[PDB]
Design a protein around this ligand. Sequence first.
Ligand code: MG
Ligand code: ZN
Ligand code: ZN
Length: 395
Amino acid sequence: MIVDGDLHIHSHYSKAVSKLMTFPIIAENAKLKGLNLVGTGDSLNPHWEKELLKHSKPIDDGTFEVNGVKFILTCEVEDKRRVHHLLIFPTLSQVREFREKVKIYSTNIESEGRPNLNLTAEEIAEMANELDILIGPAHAFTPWTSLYKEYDSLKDAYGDAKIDFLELGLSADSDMADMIKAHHSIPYLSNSNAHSPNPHRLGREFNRFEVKDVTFEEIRKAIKGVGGRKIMLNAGLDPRLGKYHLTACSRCYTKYTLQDAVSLSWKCPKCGGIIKKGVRDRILELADTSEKPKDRPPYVRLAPLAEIIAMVLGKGIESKAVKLLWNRFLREFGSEIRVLIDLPIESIASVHEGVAKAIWAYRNNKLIIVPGGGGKYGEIRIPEEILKAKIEDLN
DNA sequence: GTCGTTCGCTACATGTCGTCGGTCTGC
DNA sequence: GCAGACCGACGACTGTAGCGAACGAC
Ligand SMILES: [Mg+2]
Ligand SMILES: [Zn+2]
Ligand SMILES: [Zn+2]
């Protein structure tokens, strides 16, 4: 069976997140967005474990279910060098063992969602492999809290340790990640690290797996690509829409080239901000080979349907008209990805014409995209001739 | 016209811990 | 005067009350 899953979210116990980020709301929004599997997130926090045991029903010893949505134990943690690490746990016993094992190395493990572990990345990965915990550098291209903002390679970060995946993130896709030779030997994950259960937030990037049943073991086999199970698709946000694609300032958000960045010494001239190196320039710095493996699954660059509706209606992202249109679209059809890629333009025009034309322009890549960097998301704008024209004379 | 309804932009939070300037000290 | 110790502020890790102001069925 084919299942879509987003295995990287943060509960309300994390900081700068939404208080509506609870199990029922997440399950409802995922079921409405056509999302089969959702990672628990913040599984190291005991209060979140209590809420999970209260609101959900167990499938086995590591897979749970609520409102028809499956859940696997996941958690993002922080490093002593301030590096994000995503972990997937087989069962709840592994969760409790890993928790009690690091209580002496942390002070907010029973207080925060993404906590602070005073341990080397090598030590964390070794402890994870000891208990067969899946571990990977989450959004490892961010110039703030990632791996490549601190280290230059995975071997220098983990040493004698072994990882199980590598989360790409918003500002990256499979090609630029595969531009590094070592990355050829590691499966990718297109996750969200999302904080709000909003349409454009929850499940902005997910992974489509082929499995036999919906359990942790099948997900592990699909990640490792064994026994017929495999990660057959990586649905992700366009890198130009991420918050740190290009190199820009952290205050004025002015885009600067890598050459101009080195010239100004990371000092913003007309602002004074601390310009941070985008993921594109970082990947270009760590350029290995122009080749990429064949077994790499395809990465479909998609945009949030909510933002498309907002830019078509000329209204905000959180407005009520765009919410009504999004709800009507999700009622008439299946999920966001269906209307974005799979659904034909003529069927989309049955609900709204301008939205169908914008989706056509996005599929044919005639949609204007201004990249984002330094903390600002990329923006999308449709040309005038695409909006004023009909549909038959379009293609 | 009328007054509920909604839009879009500004401000602000919850805390841990680095980075980044500025300041004190003891020489 | 200056190296080193000390200090404060600043923001990610974004989401959202909230607040005038334009809006839209009667
Ligand atoms: Mg992406
Ligand atoms: Zn993170
Ligand atoms: Zn600046």
